[PDB]
């Protein structure tokens, strides 16, 4: 009951139990890291169901119990170089290696933004977020 | 890109979360962290098609038997998990399988029976028992270990193929 429902980047969500004393950061670090999201590339918001604005930013160290029963959203900070991969069938004439398992890669898949090259049976090991400083 | 709404159900402590996180993040947590509600999205290649997996990790604690019916309705495929260590959790797969079939009003429901915690040496559930229960439901059965990542890809890959076949 002492819980908070938090909408997360890329249309994910979590419910966290709020142990007394914890900050929003302490409550949400794992759920973000386990999704490959760096908490430093993120802001936490209080959803405003009664405003011109949809949400107002909160401090990360805000004590979480202060918001039991509210609905929170975490978003990427403005313009962070994280995105979703964009995969494509690719066939490698030249000897190439899988970035996941370093075995030979003959017939695989590559992201067209970051370049990760992999075997199908290795795809679940490709990091969730595409990193782009191009 | 086709999205696939998957739901992982089963007794508390059978390894639903350990399995899912091993899928999403290639890591293995050996800690106690009972889930309430957790949703994940990750891209995966299956039979050449890149597709989007939207996975909901559910609470196995019976203290959350009320939010169950709503998430079972929206979900397209179900991973019914039990631990080879716990017989109760094996027999309770029936309770979860009937609860799903009520909200989906059909028995051609995309389902995969999953036996987790294969690494441990105290195996109280035999492969044959599980295959029998899977043949009884007309669904696939798959043995897994979230510790060693055995069949984690196979379990989710096979659920998606069940969706595609039922999609016809
Ligand atoms: N040795 C071993 N331990 C496992 C395996 N899978 C899960 N565990 C352990 O089982 C415990 C609970 O697993 P967890 O993933 O939290 O299970 P759950 O089914 O999600 N629990 P809940 O329903 O409460 O959220 C943890 O100690 C975890 O490390 C496995 O394959 N091998
Ligand atoms: Mg869990
Ligand atoms: Zn990429
Ligand atoms: Zn590989
Ligand atoms: Zn029972």
Residue numbers in the entry:
A (entry chain B): 55 to 188
B (entry chain A): 1 to 168
Sentences from the study reporting this entry:
To understand if oncogenic mutations at G12, G13, and Q61 positions in KRAS have any effect on KRAS-RBDCRD interaction interfaces, and to identify any druggable pockets at the KRAS-RBDCRD interface, we attempted to crystallize and solve the structures of G12C/D/V, G13D, and Q61L/R mutants of KRAS in complex with RAF1(RBDCRD). We were able to obtain well-diffracting crystals of G12V, G13D, and Q61R mutants of KRAS complexed with RAF1(RBDCRD) and solved their structures in the resolution range between 2.11–2.87 Å. Since the mutant structures belong to the same crystal form as the WT KRAS-RBDCRD structure obtained in crystal form II, we used this structure to examine any structural changes in KRAS and at KRAS-RBDCRD interfaces. Structural superposition of WT KRAS-RBDCRD with all three mutant structures shows similar interaction interfaces, suggesting that the two RAS-binding domains of RAF1 bind to oncogenic KRAS mutants similarly to WT KRAS. A closer examination of the switch regions of KRAS shows minor conformational changes in the structures of oncogenic mutants complexed with RBDCRD when compared with WT KRAS-RBDCRD structure. The presence of a larger side chain at G12, G13, or Q61 position results in local rearrangement of side chains of some of the neighboring residues present in the switch regions without perturbing interactions at KRAS-RBDCRD interfaces. The side chain of R61 in the KRAS Q61R-RBDCRD structure points towards the KRAS-RBD interface and occupies an empty space surrounded by KRAS residues Y64, P34, and I36, therefore not impacting the KRAS-RBD interface. These results suggest that RAF1 does not differentiate between WT and oncogenic mutants of active KRAS.
The interaction of membrane-bound active RAS with RAF is the first step in the activation of this pathway. Active RAS recruits RAF to the membrane where RAF dimerizes and becomes active. The N-terminal CR1 region contains the RAS-binding domain (RBD) and the cysteine-rich domain (CRD), the CR2 region contains a 14-3-3 recognition site, whereas the C-terminal CR3 region includes the kinase domain and a second binding site for 14-3-3 proteins. Here, we present crystal structures of wild-type and oncogenic mutants of KRAS in complex with the RBD and CRD of RAF1.
